Amino acid sequence: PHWLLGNLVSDFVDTFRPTARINSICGRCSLLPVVNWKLDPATLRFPLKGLLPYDKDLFEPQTALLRYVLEQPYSRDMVCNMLGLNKQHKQRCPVLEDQLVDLVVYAMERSETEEKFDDGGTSQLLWQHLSSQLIFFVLFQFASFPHMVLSLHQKLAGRGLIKGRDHLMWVLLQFISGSIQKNALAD
Amino acid sequence: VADVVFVIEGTANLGPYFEELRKHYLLPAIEYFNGGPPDFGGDYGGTQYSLVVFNTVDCAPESYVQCHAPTSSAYEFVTWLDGIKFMSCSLIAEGLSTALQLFDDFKKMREQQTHRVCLLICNSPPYLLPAVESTTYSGCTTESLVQKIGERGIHFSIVSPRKLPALRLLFEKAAPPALLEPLQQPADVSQD
Amino acid sequence: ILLEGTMNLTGEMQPLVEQLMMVKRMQHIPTPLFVLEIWKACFVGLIESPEGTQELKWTAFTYLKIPQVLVKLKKYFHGEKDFTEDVNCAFEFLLKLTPLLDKADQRCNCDCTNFLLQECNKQGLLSEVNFASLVGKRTADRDPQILRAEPTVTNILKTMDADHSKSPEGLLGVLGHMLSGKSLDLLLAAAAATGKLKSFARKFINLNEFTTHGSGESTKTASVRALLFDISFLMLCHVAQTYGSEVILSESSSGEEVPFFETWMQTCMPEEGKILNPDHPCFRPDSTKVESLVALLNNSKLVQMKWHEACLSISAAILEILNAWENGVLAFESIQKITDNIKGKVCSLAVCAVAWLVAHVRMLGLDEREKSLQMIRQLAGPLYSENTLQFYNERVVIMNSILEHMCADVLQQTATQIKFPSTGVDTMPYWNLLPPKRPIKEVLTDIFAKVLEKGWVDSRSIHILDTLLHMGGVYWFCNNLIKELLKETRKEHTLRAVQLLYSIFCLDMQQVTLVLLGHILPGLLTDSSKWHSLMDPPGTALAKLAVWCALSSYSSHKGQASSRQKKRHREDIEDYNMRDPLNRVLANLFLLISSILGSRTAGPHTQFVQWFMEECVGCLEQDSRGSILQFMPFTTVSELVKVSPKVVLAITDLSLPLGRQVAAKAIA
Amino acid sequence: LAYVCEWEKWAKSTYCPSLPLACAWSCRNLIAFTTDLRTHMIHILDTEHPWEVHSVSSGHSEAITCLEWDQSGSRLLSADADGQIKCWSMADHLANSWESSVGSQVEGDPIVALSWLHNGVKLALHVEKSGASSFGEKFSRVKFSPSLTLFGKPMEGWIAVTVSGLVTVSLLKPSGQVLTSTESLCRLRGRVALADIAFTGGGNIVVAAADGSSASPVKFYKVCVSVVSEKCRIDTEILPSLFMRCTTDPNRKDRFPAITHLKFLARDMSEQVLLCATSSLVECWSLRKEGLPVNNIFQQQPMILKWRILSATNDLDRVSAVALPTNTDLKVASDTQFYPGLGLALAFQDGSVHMVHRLSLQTMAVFYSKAMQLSWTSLALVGIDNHGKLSMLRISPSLGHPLEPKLALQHLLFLLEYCMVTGYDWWDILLHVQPGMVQSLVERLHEEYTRQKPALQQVLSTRILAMKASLCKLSRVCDYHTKLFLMAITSTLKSLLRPHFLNTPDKSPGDRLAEICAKITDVDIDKVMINLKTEEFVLDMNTLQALQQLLQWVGDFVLYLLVSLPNQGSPLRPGHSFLRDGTSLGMLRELMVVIRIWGLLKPSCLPVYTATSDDSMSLLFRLLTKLWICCRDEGAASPASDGLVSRLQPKQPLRLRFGRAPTLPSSTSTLQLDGLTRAPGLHLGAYPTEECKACTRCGCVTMLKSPNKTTAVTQWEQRWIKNCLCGGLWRRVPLSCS
Structure with missing residues (x-):
């Protein structure tokens, strides 16, 4: 706030911090075993406490929440009760899309951690359907497709997406096969 | 197929004339050598081509050449068409030696031979009368011509403007078939 | 306390009490909460960071810090709650948080009995009249809830090693020192209690020097003497590799003598020390240089226990590495000769090996032939299958291996993965631990973002920051730290972060604070960008840190951290009591204070110096000392009237006649 | 003595303790002035009229270092590397307008400039002596390949290693601005505080130094830059380490050096110097291959670096920048020639600069009364030594200390020819002997232009004309200077007008035909036009481009040439001009006949500009040819032509431009300037009373508008975007119309 006023407003919000803290719960690690409300944001910010709570642990979006949500099938209901409602007219590609790109970016490590010991166990045998349903979530979200290109930019950082070329090609093929005819060619 | 090479020199002489030169001669370089008006994947198979640009040695403090077109994916060349630089003789031989060494490197490592052809473009009647005091080449423009045509079977060509330079007479040393007799008033030929 | 314990557990007789008094009186000073904080400190460590001998150092530091706070309570204050009932409610508050002792038991496995034992030991001079009852009542909660706990054995061996022998007589018990060295290195823990560290090291070095005595006559007698001297030399080398700074300090603290400390001090250190390898060690002992190697290859006689050229054996190793790789006279026959040369009681062998590792890392390094050669060659793997007169081919061998591992560690790190010849239990806990493929722009997240919520110093981060400072520069250090600090916008977090920032500055506090002030504060009040930056309420505690570090700097606190001793070499006029650096530093501070008070422009820096003057409420202070030499600031005090009892206090600079006059002026 | 600069509303910021400063430029426009007076912006100014100072705000803090790569506009912009290489070329070279070359340096201090373009040039002067080498045996050229010589294409960038970190610098930008960052923390561990050496024999860059005399390891990391595309996989080959000799010296071990720099040739030179307070020990080391003397120490790969x-040398000193930045060869037994090479300079922060010849360190001049470097091989320096709020001054630049006029002029001509062949700006005039010998100099120049050319002068004439002009500038013969300037402008005008022959295909070319047009009839150009040809000369219906710009210009030039003839007894031995060439007059005749053809085609011809065209250029051309037969070749000047030209018609205007440059004769005599506040006292016309447009200032006379309001005259604009003849000094003089 304005540099004219002294430390009075700072001490004010300080001495009222315990009031909001009385309404705090915890660090909000994760609460989402749903297979179908609480823990449901609107745009990167779920809470409602009108006072001034503590640092970004309550301000920053619960990215871990989205990461844990997208790791399971039938996750459509989560984002649906969150933001999915007439997506063809409302879901104009919010920022959360890039989030799953990070998930796809994590897919790189799925092929970078010794390629899961060169497909030692069922790691890839599960990641296949994981990325399958991940691309399945892409229904009205291909807008700002350069995010995937930014993913390529994100793939340039470290350049650990070498072995992931096959899997990334596979998921992009699922995507394009799902949207081959009706979609525009240049897109 | 899809093999070309550009060498622009007439900056000060064909500054404004370059637009008409492109509209009349540079269009078939893509319309014929490709499907039509050009975003495509870029590979090293040989379908790609090169483009070299050279300036006047006089209006240049220390820099000589700025050649940049290894592959260009057949579209990046279309990107930097208007991205040329401007600057009386020109001494273009030092720039023709650049294309010489470039096609030498091509034949050395990029040999999968698609007999890549090369075309020169000038507006001033240049001549590097001093053929000495250079870096890695000590030949004249006629020696370079007979080396790039006679010794190397690379198809050489020079597209002159409506005027009559001396290269139209220097063409007589083009031993390989260049097909530079008829002028490209119709769509340009792959061998000018 | 965390930083001090993690940096120098020795050579801390009583500067830490001075810094404690400083931070106490120059802050809110609740004695009960004070001892609560210090106890939470001495117990928050020892559990999370250490894994091996670092835990021994931790418990030794705790049991040295408790007499420190004891004598603090004895000498500091007397006349109001004389450290009797405050200690009672302190230990009660301690007993309140049971998970503390729960984690203590999870770590030490005997924290109940060891806790009671350390309590009754500290009660040697602490108060226990009506106090042990509450401790027992608390400890009775874990009745359900063990070969030998470390705290009790340290407390027991404390006096046993203090009055160890007190008489290094001739032909003393070699078996006694043998049993002392074969067991756990509790002597390091005893020296860490600072009770005899310097004195113990001095007597040890004296015994080591006496055990040379040139040569001997009897075969078995000279053999035993050489074995004992080599064991003692290796023990001294271990004491150096553990801390060194205090060891090398006590080696040449005072006196008038010149023994062979070069081979004992200039062997290795956390620095290069290798450019001088052609200068100092490369002597010319042409007599018996290679003849000693031939005699060692033959006899694996060794009766000549003149281990003075033993450090000079780098000269023989010259021709060794020559005929081995340079001249190529032998491939492994020379290796066999060197192996026979490093047979039992091979003490300086590790020294020459580290010296030649330094010579090779100073060499091309791209060859790496001699590097891996000396690595696999000087390895203590072979447990002396032959009749090597070592007698401790297991304990002494493992200690020699861990010594060679400790030194030249980062040197071998320069090459690829070394053969790893140590094969111990736990390696060095502290290390570089820096992401190579990552810039230094990391303290914001890996350090500052954590401590933003982490109300401690996180000893891992302690060593990380310590290594980061001497690897960079204090200027950009403080500049980056302050720049990242000016985004809190939460006064509680601001105060937390600024207190931690003052904390980290230790071991370099004087020069760090001086450069910080003299570089930021002029810029912090002269540029519009810095104006808008310091325009935040977080900026209030910046001057709080300023006055807090200024007094500690003006105090006669040496703080000679050997980790930063070699780095403290500058030259600056500071663009100007006496002609002292901190003196004219504070003088320039006063000048900038007056200038920021300049009229015709009321910027946020005006409020900044206003908060600074508000924070000048302190005791035994030096802010605007007002000395009779050239101290002008007092006049600027009149301008502060434009901004009261605080004026009456600040004007009270030195109770001078002119001081009284300006005090009266301000009084109206 | 002179060269008085100052500052208007700045100071030393007494509240601020200090700040290290720097400035360096290889080509012209030397000044950078990394200094925070009263952090702050960056400065730019040329050696000519330095008072016209320019500056531009930076995009960082504390402004650690900055350095250029080629003669073109490029700076470094350290402190996290924001504002890297970006040419300006917009209106002039006095406005940064930095492009997006921002290297991804997070919390770093990049201090290094690399990605070199070509092979250097040597100085085989004494082995040549300019006898008959024809500039070949004098300026040798080593044949090797610089780094990243990928694609024979020297890509440009700044792949380096910063000062704060020890990892890498990236974002080399050949036409694409590719970041291509990497990670190599100089063998996975280290700290540094020194600057970098440019390059070794092969393609490598090696530098490391951390603490000083106490801790003195000098590590080195051989590197290979260009391996893969779209990425950098720089290597970290450990090289042998070094130190400072002072560590073993029992005199004092408290040195702690802070410079440890060395020249660009990492062959045998290593110039680590001590930086005590309290000491100054300079030291030249060896870099050659050697072998260890490991033999005879017992019964009984040797090559080790x-x-x-x-x-070594022991004295007192504080700071310095460079010793001799261009480079001569070995086996130099030329002690008789005292060229400025193989030297060194030290600076006293509280004092002056001492220059001493290296490898002997015996004795030299003292130069009595935040480091300063040299301009070029010639003895030229700048006074950025800041004892507070101090500007820059000048000192004795005399490279040749003994008195030897013949040898002095020999060295002068050698350095001038080296500058010309390098295509650099020439500023050795500050070392000139008394201006009377200047003639002899330009005399030798003509020999160098003709005798030992041998045929290169065909392409070097344009540059050497302005060269010798600016040479005779600082000399009583300024009329010769402006005459040479007019010769230059007319020559380039003719050379740009000639290629306009867009003729139909004929038996010969228009160039050689217009050249042979000189061998024509005596008079009546209206007959010469039908003698040669009149049809194939039209090229555009919108030919109305030279009338308002060039036709009046050439007409005024030729008319002044006419009226100059009766001015034989002028206050000058050659008066205003010579008119003794004829060849230039032949070009003028070609111009007048072609514009006659133009008037026949386009009625927007060149009038007589006053009245009474009864056209009138006929008698003009007649008298020009009359003096032509007196000025073709091997002929003297005539008396009838005198009477024919003496009288004047009602068609004779005046007030010609005479494109020239303002003077700067401040050798040791006089300079009326300060740090700022220039006190006031064109080719395509556009020279009104007071400028009301962009009016892009230039080197000598141009000051032409930036847009020029052109429609098809773009040939001139596209021709003068780069430097001009005595027109590399493209200034941004404001439109302070009055």
Whole structure:
């Protein structure tokens, strides 16, 4: 706030911090075993406490929440009760899309951690359907497709997406096969 | 197929004339050598081509050449068409030696031979009368011509403007078939 | 306390009490909460960071810090709650948080009995009249809830090693020192209690020097003497590799003598020390240089226990590495000769090996032939299958291996993965631990973002920051730290972060604070960008840190951290009591204070110096000392009237006649 | 003595303790002035009229270092590397307008400039002596390949290693601005505080130094830059380490050096110097291959890089920048020639600069009364030594200390020819002997232009004309200077007008035909036009481009040439001009006949500009040819032509431009300037009373508008975007119309 006023407003919000803290719960690690409300944001910010709570642990979006949500099938209901409602007219590609790109970016490590010991166990045998349903979530979200290109930019950082070329090609093929005819060619 | 090479020199002489030169001669370089008006994947198979640009040695403090077109994916060349630089003789031989060494490197490592052809473009009647005091080449423009045509079977060509330079007479040393007799008033030929 | 314990557990007789008094009186000073904080400190460590001998150092530091706070309570204050009932409610508050002792038991496995034992030991001079009852009542909660706990054995061996022998007589018990060295290195823990560290090291070095005595006559007698001297030399080398700074300090603290400390001090250190390898060690002992190697290859006689050229054996190793790789006279026959040369009681062998590792890392390094050669060659793997007169081919061998591992560690790190010849239990806990493929722009997240919520110093981060400072520069250090600090916008977090920032500055506090002030504060009040930056309420505690570090700097606190001793070499006029650096530093501070008070422009820096003057409420202070030499600031005090009892206090600079006059002026 | 600069509303910021400063430029426009007076912006100014100072705000803090790569506009912009290489070329070279070359340096201080373009040039002067070498045996050229010589294409960038970190610098930008960052923390561990050496024999860059005399490891990391595309996989080959000799010296071990720099040739030179307070020990080391003397020490790969010492020197000194930045060869037995090479300079922060010849360190001049470097091989320096709020001054630049006029002029001509062949700006005039010998100099120039050319002068004439002009500038013969300037402008005008022959295909070319047009009839150009040809000369219906710009210009020039003839007894031995060439007059005749053809085609011809065209250029051309037969070749000047030209018609205007440059004769005589506040006292016309447009200032006379309001005259604009003849000094003089 304005540099004219002294430390009075700072001490004010300080001495009222315990009031909001009385309404705090915890660090909000994760609460989402749903297979179908609480823990449901609107745009990167779920809470409602009108006072001034503590640092970004309550301000920053619960990215871990989205990461844990997208790791399971039938996750459509989560984002649906969150933001999915007439997506063809409302879901104009919010920022959360890039989030799953990070998930796809994590897919790189799925092929970078010794390629899961060169497909030692069922790691890839599960990641296949994981990325399958991940691309399945892409229904009205291909807008700002350069995010995937930014993913390529994100793939340039470290350049650990070498072995992931096959899997990334596979998921992009699922995507394009799902949207081959009706979609525009240049897109 | 899809093999070309550009060498622009007439900056000060064909500054404004370059637009008409492109509209009349540079269009078939893509319309014929490709499907039509050009975003495509870029590979090293040989379908790609090169483009070299050279300036006047006089209006240049220390820099000589700025050649940049290894592959260009057949579209990046279309990107930097208007991205040329401007600057009386020109001494273009030092720039023709650049294309010489470039096609030498091509034949050395990029040999999968698609007999890549090369075309020169000038507006001033240049001549590097001093053929000495250079870096890695000590030949004249006629020696370079007979080396790039006679010794190397690379198809050489020079597209002159409506005027009559001396290269139209220097063409007589083009031993390989260049097909530079008829002028490209119709769509340009792959061998000018 | 965390930083001090993690940096120098020795050579801390009583500067830490001075810094404690400083931070106490120059802050809110609740004695009960004070001892609560210090106890939470001495117990928050020892559990999370250490894994091996670092835990021994931790418990030794705790049991040295408790007499420190004891004598603090004895000498500091007397006349109001004389450290009797405050200690009672302190230990009660301690007993309140049971998970503390729960984690203590999870770590030490005997924290109940060891806790009671350390309590009754500290009660040697602490108060226990009506106090042990509450401790027992608390400890009775874990009745359900063990070969030998470390705290009790340290407390027991404390006096046993203090009055160890007190008489290094001739032909003393070699078996006694043998049993002392074969067991756990509790002597390091005893020296860490600072009770005899310097004195113990001095007597040890004296015994080591006496055990040379040139040569001997009897075969078995000279053999035993050489074995004992080599064991003692290796023990001294271990004491150096553990801390060194205090060891090398006590080696040449005072006196008038010149023994062979070069081979004992200039062997290795956390620095290069290798450019001088052609200068100092490369002597010319042409007599018996290679003849000693031939005699060692033959006899694996060794009766000549003149281990003075033993450090000079780098000269023989010259021709060794020559005929081995340079001249190529032998491939492994020379290796066999060197192996026979490093047979039992091979003490300086590790020294020459580290010296030649330094010579090779100073060499091309791209060859790496001699590097891996000396690595696999000087390895203590072979447990002396032959009749090597070592007698401790297991304990002494493992200690020699861990010594060679400790030194030249980062040197071998320069090459690829070394053969790893140590094969111990736990390696060095502290290390570089820096992401190579990552810039230094990391303290914001890996350090500052954590401590933003982490109300401690996180000893891992302690060593990380310590290594980061001497690897960079204090200027950009403080500049980056302050720049990242000016985004809190939460006064509680601001105060937390600024207190931690003052904390980290230790071991370099004087020069760090001086450069910080003299570089930021002029810029912090002269540029519009810095104006808008310091325009935040977080900026209030910046001057709080300023006055807090200024007094500690003006105090006669040496703080000679050997980790930063070699780095403290500058030259600056500071663009100007006496002609002292901190003196004219504070003088320039006063000048900038007056200038920021300049009229015709009321910027946020005006409020900044206003908060600074508000924070000048302190005791035994030096802010605007007002000395009779050239101290002008007092006049600027009149301008502060434009901004009261605080004026009456600040004007009270030195109770001078002119001081009284300006005090009266301000009084109206 | 002179060269008085100052500052208007700045100071030393007494509240601020200090700040290290720097400035360096290889080509012209030397000044950078990394200094925070009263952090702050960056400065730019040329050696000519330095008072016209320019500056531009930076995009960082504390402004650690900055350095250029080529003669073109490029700076470094350290402190996290924001504002890297970006040419300006917009209106002039006095406005940064930095492009997006921002290297991804997070919390770093990049201090290094690399990605070199070509092979250097040597100085085989004494082995040549300019006898008959024809500039070949004098300026040798080593044949090797610089780094990243990928694609024979020297890509440009700044792949380096910063000062704060020890990892890498990236974002080399050949036409694409590719970041291509990497990670190599100089063998996975280290700290540094020194600057970088440019390059070794092969393609490598090696530098490391951390603490000083106490801790003195000098590590080195051989590197290979260009391996893969779209990425950098720089290597970290450990090289032998080094130190400072002072560590073993029992005199004092408290040195702690802070410079440890060395020249660009990492062959045998290592110039680590001590930086005590309290001491100054300079040291030249060895970099050659050697072998260890490991033999005879017992019964009984030798090549080991043991970088030993070569020489040392113990004195007192504080700071310095460079010793001799261009470079001569070896086996130099030319002690008789005292060229400015193989030297060194030290600076006293509280004092002056001492220059001493290296490898002997015997004695030299003292130069009595935040480091300063040299301009070029010539003895030229700048006074950025800041004892507070101090500007820059000048000192004795005399490279040749003994008195030897013949040898002095020999060295002068050698350095001038080296500058010309390098295509650099020439500023050795500050070392000139008394201006009377200047003639002899330009005399030798003509020999160098003709005798030992041998045929290169065909392309060097344009540059050497302005060269010798600016040479005779600082000399009583300024009329010769402006005459040479007019010769230059007319020559380039003719050379740009000639290629306009867009003729139909004929038996010969228009160039050689217009050249042979000189061998034509005596008079009546209206007959010469039908003698040669009149049809194939039209090229555009919108030919109305030279009338308002060039036709009046050439007409005024030729008319002044006419009226100059009766001015034989002028206050000058050659008066205003010579008119003794004829060849230039032949070009003028070609111009007048072609514009006659133009008037026949386009009625927007060149009038007589006053009245009474009864056209009138006929008698003009007649008298020009009359003096032509007196000025073709091997002929003297005539008396009838005198009477014919003496009288004047009602068609004779005046007030010609005479494109020239303002003077700067401040050798040791006089300079009326300060740090700022220039006190006031064109080719395509556009020279009104007071400028009301962009009016892009230039080197000598142009000051032409930036847009020029052109429609098809773009040939001139596209021709003068780069430097001009005596027109590399493209200034941004404001439109302070009055």
